[PDB]
């Protein structure tokens, strides 16, 4: 590339000086200079026609002169930035002087390298201030000429998108400005720890304007951004991701023993989705997944295609680390000699053969680990429990695999027979054997659950539980204690409904959880009938809880990576991937 | 596969089954028995074959420290689980850990135990 | 009122929080524990005041008599209120005293217990549940032992707990005794366990400053803090 920018005003040999600055000429040169008739482009033109092999233009703002005025510096400004954007080399920062012209064009210009990146910001004098082709040429044989560099500008590497989403106008007035980065300047403070909430410490590194792009409030635009950004999933059940659609279709199709499935069920439609306008109980919002589940994946060959087809989505998501439940009694069955473990082992060895093989390719790999969901309900029968408890930790066992089991589910539950204040006794041996516990401590559950759930079974993360504001000191527990809360924001949205629900005025405590400090994640309960992957579960926390910030997205995933049922070691090589992914995909996406 | 084989030929064979010992240790990992325990019931899932697992065994010594007396909460499920369990306590048998096994643990079967002459 | 005064001249200031030791003592009034920690309790209705209570301490002699598996109802009170719970369990710490603590007890923060290297599962457990533990290089050496100690070859887990990725804190126990302050506690570890980095001090006061009983509000306020201060001291001694 090698594109020299110059700005010229009444002198023109400066031209010349800044095309010499370099030891071995230059290849393109464009200089932007204003309407007024003093500058001379004779001088310039019969310059470099000397050499036909470089690249010379000359680009001149209709309807300005002198930009004395706030309209005209204004104006000057945006056709200054426009012409910087439109000769910017594909790949290589280009160099550029700003010694001619007045200190205001200077100083629009070298702002400009600031914003849009620049090789090299020099300027260019000499004592006798030369005015021929002659004296300044003898100025540079006898070295008079200096050549003043301030150093290397790396810029802003992500701008230049503008370009693409910027036409030409070439034809143009003063209408079309594009005042998107001076938005932000404003809003620096316009609006106490909020800096200190910084994770991934490579975000110091980032540019002032994207460590501040960062602090600006989400909006609903950023869905690149969202879906470019590494995630972390930690609440996706298995049996809701393929339940209807192109993705059920061909999981059917793909069964071992088609004749004893049942393609004639179909789960009802409801309207408006993914955004219903209407609450959806619990018990219709499991009903909704009856498509998939422990009556489809019975045999092994829809268990592989579901599975691999969820694998095929997270990475098609960009994340990066997945928690998935599964229950293997619902799709065991004694017939074909298909027990709870052999379901569980198929499942993780799929899962691995999945992850082996994208890693071996050296492409991007969702690492994922299994939680054993142990639901207490069953026929009121707690047999069910204790098998469940053991299979994971018979499962734990397996020592060798990259995905193993982690932690086990509590969910099923009302009260009563089914209240986790009874059944201590049996989780001793998880707790002794090492496996975390996760609850699903939600459905409008008194706080004396929430607290037996954090106490007594000293559970780790608790699902949903969006009641945490009408119990002080469980929120001071929760708190101090460092304990997770996963939510759902679409899961949630629908079966409870949060603003902008209709003739619903309850908000959505997201926003109050994060500036209270818990370990908040955001996660996608089930892909399927919610009909919405982790991005656009993300996403909608811009309406959902309004006012939320970039840096508490960033918060949410750091939050995820903190509250995982991950090995120390593994947890630390995943945040150092994570913050350079994060690094990288910042960097190179406040471009748009 | 033995059992199967001996019965193709049609000829006498010896059907078996499998109890998995509950060791004690108090060496660390005193998780050892849990896990123990939950490996029994996962067997139990095999369903199918000859042979299968029919319960647990408490091996180990039986001293006062390590009766049977502290560990109910835990063959809870495993009793839930249908499996049978069978005592190993051999010598300082005293009556009370005995009656602990019998009552408390619900064993169905107590090994050797050649001190009951003592306590009618 | 020290606080207060230091906070006015706009100086450099140690905010402090106060632990209430309930020890041991089993000459009689067994209540005394009970007591202690209805004092703590009621002390915590102060409300105002930079200087608060935020926790108890289980100090005095640990024996299996008078271990952590009797007290769990004394305890249900003293955690529904709101105050952490630091176990002393340092002295003849058997692993499932350690235990009892961590899960009976809910301990927040062990003290000391130093013997964690031969248990896996128990590391394994205090790793995954970010439990703090307090050890003191200096008084763990005079007391216990450690290279280069002469005719003691021990070595000292510090390092071991660090790459294990433990969350431990470095103090003092008593300044008198030891005869030893905070900064001399953290320079013996050049040769209490060699080998380890500056990072890894840093480390030790990120762990010391997480694992601190501690308002969420008031830890991200001395996070900040923190950040700037070492900053500075980092530039101005490599400056230099
Ligand atoms: N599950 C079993 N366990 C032990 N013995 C069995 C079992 N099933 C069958 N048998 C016995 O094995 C024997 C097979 O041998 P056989 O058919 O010649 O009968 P037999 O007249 O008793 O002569 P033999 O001495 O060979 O047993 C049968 O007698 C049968 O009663
Ligand atoms: N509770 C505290 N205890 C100790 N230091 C504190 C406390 N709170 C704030 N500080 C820090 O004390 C410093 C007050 O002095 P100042 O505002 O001049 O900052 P400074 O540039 O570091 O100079 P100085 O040497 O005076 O600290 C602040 O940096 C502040 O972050
Ligand atoms: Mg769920
Ligand atoms: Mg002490």
């Not at 005025?69 to 400004?77: A, K, S, T």
């Not at 006798?128 to 000429?145: H, S, T, V, Y």
């Not at 590497?157 to 370009?163: D, T």
């Not at 982790?534 to 960033?554: F, K, T, Y």
């Amino acid at each position: 590339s090698r594109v020299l920018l110059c700005s010229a005003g009444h002198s023109s040999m400066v031209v010349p000086e800044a095309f010499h600055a370099v030891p071995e000429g230059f290849e393109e040169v464009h200089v932007f200079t204003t309407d007024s008739e003093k500058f001379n482009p004779v001088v310039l033109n019969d310059f470099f026609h000397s050499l036909p092999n470089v690249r010379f233009s000359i680009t001149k703002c209709h309807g300005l002169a002198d930009i004395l005025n706030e309209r005209d510096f204004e104006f000057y400004q945006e056709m200054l930035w426009q012409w910087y954007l439109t000769k910017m080399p594909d790949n290589e920062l280009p160099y550029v002087c700003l010694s001619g012209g007045i200190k205001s064009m200077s100083a629009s210009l070298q702002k400009a390298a600031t914003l849009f990146g620049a090789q090299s910001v020099f300027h260019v004098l000499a004592d006798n201030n030369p005015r021929n082709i002659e004296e300044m040429f003898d100025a540079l044989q006898k070295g008079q000429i200096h050549f003043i560099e301030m150093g290397y500008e790396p810029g802003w590497a992500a701008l230049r998108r503008l370009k693409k989403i910027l036409p030409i106008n070439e034809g143009c007035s003063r209408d079309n400005f594009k005042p998107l980065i001076s938005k932000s300047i404003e809003e620096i403070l316009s609006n106490t720890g909020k800096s200190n909430q910084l994770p991934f410490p490579s975000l110091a590194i980032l540019p002032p304007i994207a460590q501040q792009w960062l602090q600006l409030p989400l909006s609903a635009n950023d869905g690149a951004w969202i879906q470019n950004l590494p995630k972390v999933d930690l609440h996706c059940h298995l049996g809701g991701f393929a339940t209807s659609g192109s993705l059920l279709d061909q999981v059917r199709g793909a069964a071992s023993e088609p004749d004893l499935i049942d393609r004639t069920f179909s789960p009802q439609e409801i309207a408006g989705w993914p955004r219903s306008h209407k609450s959806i109980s619990l018990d219709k919002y499991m009903e909704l997944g009856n498509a998939n589940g422990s009556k489809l994946l019975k045999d092994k060959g829809c268990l592989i295609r579901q599975v691999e087809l969820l694998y095929q989505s997270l990475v098609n998501d960009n994340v990066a680390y997945a928690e998935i439940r599964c229950s293997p009694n619902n799709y065991a069955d004694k017939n074909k000699n298909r027990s709870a473990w052999v379901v569980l082992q198929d499942i993780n060895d799929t899962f691995t053969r999945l992850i082996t093989e994208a890693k071996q390719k050296n492409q991007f790999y969702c690492h994922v680990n299994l939680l054993v969901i142990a639901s207490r309900k069953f026929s009121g029968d707690l047999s069910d429990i204790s098998k469940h408890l053991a299979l994971a930790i018979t499962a734990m066992q397996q020592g060798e695999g990259v995905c193993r089991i982690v932690g086990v589910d509590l969910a099923g539950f009302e009260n009563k027979e089914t209240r986790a204040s009874y059944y201590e006794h049996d989780f001793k041996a998880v707790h002794r054997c090492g496996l975390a516990v996760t609850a699903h401590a939600g459905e409008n559950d008194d706080p004396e659950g929430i607290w037996q759930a954090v106490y007594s079974l000293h559970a780790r993360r608790l699902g949903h539980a969006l009641n945490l504001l009408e119990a002080p000191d469980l929120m001071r527990t929760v708190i101090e204690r460092k304990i997770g809360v996963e939510m759902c924001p679409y899961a949630n949205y629908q079966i409870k409904g949060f603003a902008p629900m209709p003739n619903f005025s309850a908000l959505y405590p997201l926003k109050k959880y994060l500036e209270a400090g818990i370990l908040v994640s955001v996660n996608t309960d089930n892909i399927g009938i919610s009909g919405a992957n982790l991005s656009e579960n993300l996403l909608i926390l811009a309406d959902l809880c309004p006012g939320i910030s970039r840096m508490d997205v960033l918060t949410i995933i750091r939050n995820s990576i903190e509250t995982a049922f991950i090995s120390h070691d593994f947890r630390m090589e995943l945040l150092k991937f994570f913050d350079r992914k994060i690094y990288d995909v910042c960097l190179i996406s406040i471009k748009n």
